Amino acid sequence: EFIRMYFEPGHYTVMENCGEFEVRVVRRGDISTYASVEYETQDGTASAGTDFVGRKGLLSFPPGVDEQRFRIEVIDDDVFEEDECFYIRLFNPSEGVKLAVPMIATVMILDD
Ligand SMILES: [Ca+2]
Ligand SMILES: [Ca+2]
């Protein structure tokens, strides 16, 4: 491998009423060709369908581009909740790419 991919930022703290927030994944090393990686949300103490909307996707990095950004929807309610967390993981990197820490992003939702 001559390409590494990882979340940057690796950690996101978001308010419950933010609507959506943006996650960023970076590529380091060989720029010069197309590369890709998949991601998927996963529950922590926060859960898809109650606290955020579950999402999986494919991130495409054209030649010359070293980052991709995607949005995640946070579900707002009126009920008081303690700080809760969910995660987003990278998987299935394209040929010649190796994931690097952090390859799981942490998301903490703060209640409003
Ligand atoms: Ca709220
Ligand atoms: Ca709430």
This structure's resolution (Å) is: 1.6
Domain of 35 in residue numbering reads as: 1-112
Instruction: Quote the ligand 1 centre to 36 CA distance (angstroms).
Output: 35
Alpha-carbon gap, residue 98 to 42, rounded angstroms: 21
Query: For residue 80, which ligand has an atom nearest its CA?
Result: 2
Total of domains in the chain: 1
Bind-site residues for Ca(2+): 16, 51, 76-77, 79, 81, 84, 111-112
The closest ligand to the CA of 84 turns out to be: 2
β-bridge pairing 20-29 and 3-7: antiparallel
Alpha-carbon distances of 6 from 16, 67, 88, rounded to whole Å: 25, 10, 11
Beta bridge partners of 12: 107
For residue 52, the SS3 value is: strand
Residue 91: CB atoms within 10 A of its CB come to 11
Q: Which residue type, as a one-letter code, is found at position 3?
A: I
What CATH number should be reported for the domain holding residue 66? 2.60.40.2030
Which residues line the annotated binding site?
16, 51, 76-77, 79, 81, 84, 111-112
- What SS3 class is residue 31? coil
Show the beta-strand stretches assigned E in 2-96: 3-7, 11-15, 20-29, 35-42, 56-61, 67-73, 84-91
> What is the rounded distance in angstroms from the CA atom of residue 72 to the CA atom of residue 99?
21
Both tokens of 99, joined, read 């994931």
Rounded distance between C-alpha atoms, residue 40 and residue 57, angstroms? 7
Experimental approach taken:
X-ray
**Polymer length of the chain:** 112
> Do 61 and 27 contact (CB within 8 A), yes or no?
yes
